[PDB]
Write a protein that binds this DNA or RNA. Structure first.
Lengths: 173, 176, 140, 260, 77
RNA sequence: AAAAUGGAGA
RNA sequence: GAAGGGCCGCGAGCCCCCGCGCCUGGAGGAAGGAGAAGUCGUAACAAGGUAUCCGUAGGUGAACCUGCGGAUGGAUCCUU
RNA sequence: CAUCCGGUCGAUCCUGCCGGAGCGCGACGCUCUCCCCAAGGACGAAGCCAUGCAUGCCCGCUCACCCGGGACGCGGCGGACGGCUCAGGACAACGGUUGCACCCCCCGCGGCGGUCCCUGCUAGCCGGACACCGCUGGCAACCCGGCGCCAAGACGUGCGCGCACGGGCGCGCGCCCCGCGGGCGAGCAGCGUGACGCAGCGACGGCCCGCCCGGGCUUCCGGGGCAUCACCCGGUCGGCGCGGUCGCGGCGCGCCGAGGGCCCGACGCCUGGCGGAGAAUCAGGGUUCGACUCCGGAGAGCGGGCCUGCGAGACGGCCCGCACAUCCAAGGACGGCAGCAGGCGCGGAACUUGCCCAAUGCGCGGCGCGCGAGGCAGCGACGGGGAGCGCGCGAGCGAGGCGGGCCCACAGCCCCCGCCGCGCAGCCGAGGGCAAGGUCUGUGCCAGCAGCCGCGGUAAUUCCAGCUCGGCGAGCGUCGCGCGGCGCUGCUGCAGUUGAAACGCCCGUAGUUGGCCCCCCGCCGCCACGAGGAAACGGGAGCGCUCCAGGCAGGCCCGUUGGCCC
């Protein structure tokens, strides 16, 4: 397998250790998942959001980021949550190339739709910055769940001077 | 794992450090005649057994009395040597092993008892009589010459019924 | 000898022993590793082979007679080395190429006794021991 | 290498099993179960050798299956049945039942046991671990883990079993100096009471044990198997923990050698 | 190294052939945090931990800075 | 002033 | 949803330049070594007939000789 | 377990090495009347394999021109165990010490065993759908062609308690330190809230958690030579994110900052380099070897990839690259013995193309089978441990012949009985060390001998033989080897004014070494000294195989053993 073994890496002093044996199945590595997010299904129907379960050591079952576009967010302040399909991947931060293919990454800042979260405007001015994001149908949030290992699209909502730090980049930079 | 091959081997026969020394050489023949030993490997076999019996005592002597490793081993040393009779049971001393005699191990050998008790009256006669199954310890007939009997049961040495003791009725070629 | 002695000097003594170990002719003989490659015999009691040209090496002094030996190429290393024949008049049996085993002269390298320049000694010819051929114990 | 393995050669046998090195191409490995590998002496020797009820292991194979031994109601065909301290080997036909106690010489030996003693078997406990969605459980030294234990007890409590439903007989709690019975190192069949606790904010707790002989010795608390809240409360071996010494062993056999 | 210190322990090894010793040394890496900044020549404990990185497995806890220059002296503490 | 050999091996 | 195709993730091998490292083939040179009786001188060992000997240069059939600074293991433990 | 002696000479006293002398292991050679226990293709060939065998076991589901014996298949589980060889591999493998609150696991074993339902519902039992077979296909084989029915303790749809309950989420203790309990040494688990969501199994309801278990990392202390290898690494080295894995991680993939490691020898290079438990020989102190029992690691001609599974990069799994094959009818296929025999090759050399599951363990399985694992015999001067060829004046046996007994999967063997009994030896020397003829024959420094030191030049204690005789002995010698010898490798414990040897001289950095001196404190080191540390083996209880070598048995028995030191 595409192993992940210490012997393959050089020693700290720069020694190149010859591997004692061949590569091992419990040290096996797998295909990095490139997640697919649909801006619109529109006329085409060939692609749908499908998830992959894979064989693992010990029989454990792993859900994967095969095709995930629908997304869930729980307002930290409210503790209530709403589920819809998120707009796309906006701030991978590791690479801007990943954003183009909408490859989802754990806790990568994304573009969030407000199809069921428009209800926030009914409460009086809760998170006015979120209120300005919710009516627009475009928000910022980090999908804080592991997509490749556990196939999860549930995520937190961005609130706090952390959202402002990201927003300063998200607005013109 | 070749389980039946598993075993151990021993080296009773140990040759000396300088072979052609006149005193050692002469004593060999002199001892060979005294106890009637057929092969010269045996005297060295005796030397190896004698040394082990000499070292245990030297190390034991350098230990203080009643030291458990000393006390248990000392009583052990005396027990085995007293059984042999080379150590007089009366001596009863861990230090008494030192000054030991090779002649005493030879005396313990059953071939020797037969000559001494006049059972065959000669070492040459003794080996021949044992070869012809004519001396039995406690009645257990042995044809190997060096039965080696503990002194504790020396009084139980006996002759054999086949043609020496009270003839069973098998006089070798004479019978037929 | 100066000697460096201290509770923390296991370094000087360790290097010195390792370096000054290889000073003896005997130590270097077994520890350089040259001797296994250098010896015609590959460090063995006997080596099979085929016989080549016979040889009559003059002796030195006191010994003053030619001692017939046969030069044989050992099959394994493809090298030709001479082997001293055994007892009196034992070379007449050995003539053309025949299976010959060769053994050490005791010294293990030095030429035996006073017969100069011969390192090895033949022990067999054909399939029969050459010391039996001499006694006619085992002969063709 | 590769996956897990299931074979044992006749040298890898723990030297406390005292199975003979000779007369063995391969050792009897015990199958995993209530009792761990090192501790359980395979039941083949218990019937084939100690009892000498079976001439061969094949003879142990012939009768073990048909309900001939029942600790907590179970026999099995396997002569690798897992067993340990205070396990009541039960034989109806032998007209007797027995508890295997660690003999001083480090091999668990069956002591013929009375039916009241047959009723109770003992397994130690460690610390309560949440199991079943937080529904409480207690970790045990032998595999008998149970849900809903006594709520107040906290750590290192010995436990006894009725052998059928076998609900915990007693939650013995250590009071320090409580009659203890560690069984590890040289504590094989040794009786005493505890003294000094050296947890030391460090691994392996050293507990000193004062003894009837007079010896106080620290040890891993891992091998503790308390005998009674006070007194042995369960019959101990014929040694009674007194522990014999090699000098007597030569004499006890020496009279025995003359006596036979 | 960023937020990382290389601490050197010294081991005195008894060699039997010569009862004199060798001062072999080892340099091990850990993770310091700006909460306890370190001076040169300090006694720094390292805790056995989760394997952090390729060389990182330890983490600093207690720092005791020594005055002026501490040099070495091969002192194991 | 010149002024050189001394076979082998008991 | 197979036979296929594609984008690729891995991946032995290949090829082309090198950077090593180990092994080896040589026409012929250039040495070393060994065996009772070869040659030409005869250097040194007695101040061995010019006492040696070292370093360094120069020559030289061949050892050797010569120049200059030393050391005696010198043939001088010794006259203002 | 504390040692010599032959040799530089005209002699002496030396240094110094050569040689014997001791001891183990394998060749080799000369040889064997024994008997018993026994290693056995490790040695620059992990070279090639012809020929057979080496993981098989039960039919829930049998409807098979049978019987109570059941084929077959579907399924169930095992072939990830073992056996073998150490090729590769030098902060690795490896021994012991940590932890995994960075983690998976099948067997078994003790708990749990509520499982909303949107949909379809028969929920007291729903499907349609494959083998076996039936019928007829090809090829030179390999290889498996269709069709037709047909069942499952086969496979699949689905009922059932929204404190449904799959994970994984999102989110919610603290309040300067520390204690509390489901808690630990450690604020860790769990619960609640909010969003999803479809794990159970279930068509004969078993998912889940523990315990064990075997892994998977990991912490320290160890873990070949070479400096005629000194500066080396460039994901290299620290962070910062992320992917990926059972999992932590440069492991990968982005992003940065310039780090790492070194004369206490880094990096490099080499290794006829598997490490250890061990083994050899020795007073101590050592030295040497570890492939073979066992223990861990690897690897099945060679590199890669992959499946199946709970675990293998398995190789008597697969698929490709590369070599080399085999069949091959020219169209194809199909290997893998560093498993057991047995060949070829190779070398100095290294066992039956045997029998075989009764045991000894392991698989499937309460009513037994397999396992060239092993067991057994064969072979076998690897080696051991113990007899004989007489003793005596008579008569005595043991190598054997035949039958019995005994024995043994089957036979054998010791043994036990009788008629009988066919007792029978080598290979090294004889000048010294080193023990034993200046006997007697050839003999001319010739042959030859000759470890060594030395003999044969015409009168040999030294060869060539027959005398004799010394040693050892059914084993003797010849070699190569390791140790002792050898304080000739020196730490103990060596030399250096002339034997072998003080740098031509001085500064100098690491390195090594620093006087007295502060009683009491705290760390070093340091001993005493425990806990917990697998054996085998060895030190070492007890024990008479016909005596040991052996083995851990034995008997009216310490709960008889097998203690104890490793």
């Amino acid at each position: 397998g595409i192993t992940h073994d210490k012997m393959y890496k050089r020693s700290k002093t720069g020694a190149v250790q010859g591997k004692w044996h061949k590569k091992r199945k419990y040290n096996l590595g797998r295909q990095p998942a490139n997640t697919k997010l649909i801006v619109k299904v529109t006329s085409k129907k060939n692609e749908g959001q499908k998830i992959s379960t894979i064989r693992c050591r010990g029989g454990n079952i792993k859900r994967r980021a095969l095709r995930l576009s629908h997304g869930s967010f729980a307002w930290g302040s409210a503790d209530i949550s709403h589920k819809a399909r998120i707009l796309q991947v906006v701030y991978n931060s590791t690479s801007n190339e990943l954003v183009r293919t909408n490859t989802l990454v754990k806790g990568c800042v994304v573009q969030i739709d407000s199809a069921p979260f428009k209800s926030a405007l009914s409460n009086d001015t809760l998170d006015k910055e979120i209120l300005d994001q919710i009516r627009g149908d475009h928000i910022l949030a980090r999908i804080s769940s592991r997509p490749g290992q556990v196939g999860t699209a549930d995520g937190y909502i961005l609130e706090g001077p952390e959202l402002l730090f990201y927003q300063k980049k998200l607005a013109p930079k | 794992p070749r389980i039946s091959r598993h075993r151990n081997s021993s080296k009773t026969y140990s040759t000396p450090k300088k072979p052609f020394t006149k005193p050692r050489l002469d004593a060999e023949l002199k001892l060979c005649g005294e106890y009637g030993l057929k092969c010269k490997r045996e005297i060295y076999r005796a030397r190896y057994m004698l040394a082990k019996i000499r070292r245990t005592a030297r190390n034991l002597l350098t230990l203080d009395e009643n030291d458990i490793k000393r006390r248990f081993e000392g009583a052990a040393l005396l027990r085995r040597l007293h059984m042999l009779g080379i150590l007089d049971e009366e001596k009863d001393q861990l230090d008494y092993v030192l000054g030991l005699r090779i002649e005493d191990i030879f005396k313990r050998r059953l071939q020797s008892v037969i000559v001494e008790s006049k059972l065959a009256k000669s070492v040459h006669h003794a080996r021949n009589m044992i070869k012809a199954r004519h001396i039995s310890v406690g009645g257990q007939i042995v044809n190997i010459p060096s039965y080696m009997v503990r002194i504790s049961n020396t009084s139980r040495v006996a002759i054999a019924d086949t043609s020496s003791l009270a003839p069973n009725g098998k006089p070798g070629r004479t019978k037929r | 000898s100066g000697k460096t002695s201290g509770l923390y000097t296991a370094r000087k003594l360790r290097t010195i022993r390792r370096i000054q170990r290889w000073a003896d002719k005997r130590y270097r003989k077994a520890h350089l590793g040259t001797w296994l490659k250098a010896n015609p015999l590959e460090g063995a009691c006997m080596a099979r082979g085929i016989v080549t040209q016979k040889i009559g090496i003059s002796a030195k002094q006191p010994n003053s007679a030619v001692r017939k030996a046969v030069r044989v190429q050992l099959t394994k290393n493809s090298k030709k080395i001479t082997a001293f024949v055994p007892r009196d008049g034992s070379l007449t049996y050995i003539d053309n190429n025949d299976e010959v085993l060769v053994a050490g002269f005791g010294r293990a390298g030095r030429a035996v006794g006073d017969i100069p320049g011969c390192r090895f000694k033949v022990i067999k010819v054909a399939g029969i021991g050459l010391l039996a051929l001499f006694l006619r114990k085992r002969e063709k | 290498a590769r996956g897990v393995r299931k074979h044992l050669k006749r040298l890898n046998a723990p030297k406390h099993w005292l199975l003979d090195k000779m007369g063995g191409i391969w050792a009897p490995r015990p199958t995993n179960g209530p009792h761990g590998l090192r501790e359980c002496i395979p039941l083949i020797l218990i019937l084939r050798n100690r009892l000498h009820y079976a001439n061969t292991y094949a003879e142990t194979s012939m009768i073990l299956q048909d309900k001939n031994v029942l600790i907590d109601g179970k026999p099995r065909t396997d002569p690798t049945f897992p067993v340990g301290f205070m396990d009541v080997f039960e034989i109806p036909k032998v007209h007797k039942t027995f508890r295997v106690l660690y003999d001083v010489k480090g091999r668990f030996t069956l002591v013929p046991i009375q039916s009241n003693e047959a009723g109770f078997k003992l397994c130690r406990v460690q610390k309560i671990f949440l199991g079943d969605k937080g529904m409480p459980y207690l970790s045990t030294h032998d595999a008998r883990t149970i849900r809903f234990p006594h709520p107040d007890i906290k750590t290192n409590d010995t436990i006894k079993i009725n052998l059928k439903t076998g609900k915990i007989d007693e939650w013995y709690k250590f009071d320090i100096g409580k009659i203890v019975m560690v069984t590890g190192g040289r504590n094989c069949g040794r009786i005493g009471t505890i003294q000094a606790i050296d947890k030391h904010m460090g691994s392996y707790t050293m507990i000193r044990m004062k003894d009837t002989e007079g010896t106080e010795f620290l040890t891993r608390l891992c091998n503790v198997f308390v005998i009674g809240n006070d007194s042995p409360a369960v019959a101990i071996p014929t040694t009674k923990g007194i522990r014999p010494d090699i000098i007597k062993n030569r004499e006890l056999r020496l009279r025995s050698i003359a006596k036979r | 190294m960023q937020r990382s210190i290389i601490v050197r322990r010294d081991y005195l090894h008894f060699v039997q052939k010569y009862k004199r010793y060798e001062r072999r040394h080892k340099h091990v890496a850990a993770h310091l945090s700006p909460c306890f900044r370190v001076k040169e020549g300090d006694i720094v404990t390292i805790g056995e931990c989760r394997p952090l990185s390729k060389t990182i497995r330890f983490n600093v806890i207690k720092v005791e800075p020594v005055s002026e220059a501490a040099k070495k002296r091969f002192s194991p503490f």
